């Protein structure tokens, strides 16, 4: 009974041959030749850019980079916040086979270093506002030869724009419509180097195959959205941290108009939803809970709105139903995905929504639950660790096969670290830190309630509450604590403090264990074991 191992259906679109760059180029060239087809729309400055514009300039950046000298043994960095120019160097680079590491616009200067030491990039594309931060970081990274400014047409601080850079390297008679992109092995050639849990962000290497699969999902009437003319999307989610990246690529495959918003604003948001006739909106999790509090939605004509998507962020069932009610939608489309799996591999399918589920397994994939101790795969309705195997899994963490391994067993399964179960109808469900309850006496306090108290203390930098299992009491509630840098404290001084703000059953009878860091779990969510694990010895 390899039969409690859950399997994604058949694709509507078969996987297509070619690299990620070869199929983007082929799709975009189709839409380039229809004048007026809009690719991106900047909701802030109201400017539109057509596929003809988008195709042509991307191609030129590909042949201008090829000439400069970049082959698949080089990487570039794109450092900018969501913009009309963002996917120009990305598209151009994939056409070449150069690996793209999107960097985080307002990563502070330290996290800009950690990202770029892993990605070791020859050329860096950057927005005017990102420039000095990358200048500073270039004087600490010798590999960064060239800096190109994305949001200019002229040069800017003597530095060169994509536009003058391209005319500085394209050969005399270059022809955007005779360009052909490189063929290369899509399994070994890295398309994207993404970022990320505990410690410092790693570099998740993802080869062209994962985007090629993604391109099969995006069109899927069940797991993506149907190629209808005049489809538009309002995307707020960042063009890096996952979601934003691979929906937009799939959206360019489909010919959709991607309406981007880089700064969030309620009225701007809702009006763009209305005016652009948006079919589906993309949101980050805490923009869902915001929209649960919105009372203006009713004043806008969202007659056209079909879907609101949360991506690979699993949603509180209460927040999801709230958002969907304020917009008069049957449901939210939530899914579960890891950066280490490119896109989501659990997605709620069209129509088949089921209250509280993230969804079912995407085509090309297998997902299963495994018992946390024996490792044996479990059956229907049992909670275990969620494990997934399929083409979109990360190739590895750059410069870190010690982490790549033991995250992926060499039967090709990624072990999520997150806990789940599935239905007799094959829906999956994710279990969160946030409603695992600590039974002392026999009534239970949420660990988030006790964490909120602990984080309130000026000398407690981070906390993590879990239930110390003791034989007499049932569960004594305990915490792992991280002290602020200057400060010093004592276990009892900490529980004295809690036991002054909680009922008396909610008191921190389990004690505190001082840790350098509270264990997170891949999607950043607090890991309920390890914490429980950590306290069990210290007692
Ligand atoms: B960390 C992370 C990793 C991956 C992702 C996925 O790319 C989301 C994919 C998705 C979800 C819902 C949709 O409706 C659509 C779509 O519009 O096709 C697409 C999100 C976060």
From Swiss-Prot:
Q: Which Pfam families match?
A: AMP-binding (PF00501), AMP-binding_C (PF13193)
Which keywords appear in this protein's UniProt record, sorted alphabetically? ATP-binding, Luminescence, Magnesium, Metal-binding, Monooxygenase, Nucleotide-binding, Oxidoreductase, Peroxisome, Photoprotein
InterPro entries registered for this protein in UniProt: AMP-bd_C (IPR025110), AMP-bd_C_sf (IPR045851), AMP-binding_CS (IPR020845), AMP-dep_synth/lig_dom (IPR000873)
What this protein catalyses is: firefly D-luciferin + ATP + O2 = firefly oxyluciferin + hnu + AMP + CO2 + diphosphate
- Is Kinase included in the keywords of this UniProt record? no
User: Any idea where this protein resides?
Assistant: Peroxisome
A GO biological-process term: bioluminescence
The record's section on Gene3D superfamilies has: 3.30.300.30, 3.40.50.980, Luciferase, Domain 3
Where it mainly occurs, coarsely classed, is other
TM helices/strands, residue ranges: none
Family according to the record: Belongs to the ATP-dependent AMP-binding enzyme family.
**Task performed by this protein:** Produces green light with a wavelength of 562 nm.
Alphabetical list of PANTHER family matching this protein: GM05240P, LONG-CHAIN-FATTY-ACID--COA LIGASE
Protein name according to UniProt: Luciferin 4-monooxygenase
């Amino acid at each position: 009974d390899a039969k409690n191992i859950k399997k994604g259906p058949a694709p509507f679109y078969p996987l297509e041959d070619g690299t990620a760059g070869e199929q983007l180029h082929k799709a975009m060239k189709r839409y380039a030749l229809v004048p007026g087809t809009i690719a991106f729309t900047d909701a802030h400055i109201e400017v539109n850019i057509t596929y003809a514009e988008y195709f042509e300039m991307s191609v030129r950046l590909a042949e201008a980079m090829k000439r400069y000298g970049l082959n698949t043994n080089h990487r570039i960095v794109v450092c900018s916040e969501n913009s009309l120019q963002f996917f120009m160097p990305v598209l151009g680079a994939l056409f070449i086979g150069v690996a793209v590491a999107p960097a985080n616009d307002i990563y502070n200067e330290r996290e800009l270093l950690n990202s770029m030491n892993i990605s070791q990039p020859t050329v860096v594309f950057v927005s005017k506002k990102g420039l000095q931060k990358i200048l500073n970081v270039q004087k600490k990274l010798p590999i960064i030869q060239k800096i190109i400014i994305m949001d200019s047409k002229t040069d800017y601080q003597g530095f060169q724009s994509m536009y003058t850079f391209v005319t500085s390297h394209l050969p005399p008679g270059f022809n955007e419509y005779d360009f052909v992109p490189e063929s290369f092995d899509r399994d070994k050639t890295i398309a994207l180097i993404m970022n990320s849990s505990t410690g410092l962000p790693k570099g998740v290497a993802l080869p062209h195959r994962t985007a090629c699969v993604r391109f099969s999902h995006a069109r899927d009437p069940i797991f993506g959205n149907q190629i209808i003319p005049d489809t538009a999307i309002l995307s707020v989610v960042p063009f890096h941290h996952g979601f934003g990246m691979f929906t937009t690529l799939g959206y360019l495959i489909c010919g959709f108009r991607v309406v981007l918003m880089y700064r969030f604003e309620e009225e701007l948001f809702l009006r763009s939803l209305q005016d652009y006739k948006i079919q589906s909106a993309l949101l980050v999790p805490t923009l869902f809970s915001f929209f649960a509090k919105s009372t203006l939605i009713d004043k806008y004509d969202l007659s056209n709105l079909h879907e609101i998507a949360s991506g690979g962020a699993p949603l509180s069932k209460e927040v999801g139903e709230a958002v969907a009610k304020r917009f008069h939608l049957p449901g939210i489309r939530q899914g579960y995905g890891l950066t280490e799996t490119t896109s989501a591999i659990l997605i709620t399918p069209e129509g088949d929504d089921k209250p509280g589920a993230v969804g079912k397994v995407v085509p090309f994939f297998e997902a299963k639950v495994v018992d946390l101790d024996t490792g044996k795969t479990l059956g229907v309705n049992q909670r275990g660790e969620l494990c997934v195997r399929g083409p979109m899994i990360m190739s590895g963490y750059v410069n870190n096969p010690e982490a790549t391994n033991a995250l992926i067993d060499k039967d090709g399964w990624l072990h999520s670290g997150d806990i789940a179960y599935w239905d007799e109808d094959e829906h999956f469900f994710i279990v969160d830190r946030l409603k695992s309850l600590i039974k002392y006496k026999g009534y239970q306090v949420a660990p988030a309630e006790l964490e909120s108290i602990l984080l309130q203390h000026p000398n407690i930098f981070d906390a993590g509450v879990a239930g110390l299992p003791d034989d007499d009491a049932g569960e004594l509630p305990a915490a792992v604590v991280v002290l602020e840098h200057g400060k010093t404290m004592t276990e009892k001084e900490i529980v004295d403090y809690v036991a002054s703000q909680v009922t008396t059953a909610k008191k921190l009878r389990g004690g505190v264990v001082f840790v350098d860091e509270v264990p997170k779990g891949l999607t950043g969510k607090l890991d309920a074991r390890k914490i429980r694990e950590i306290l069990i010895k210290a007692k």
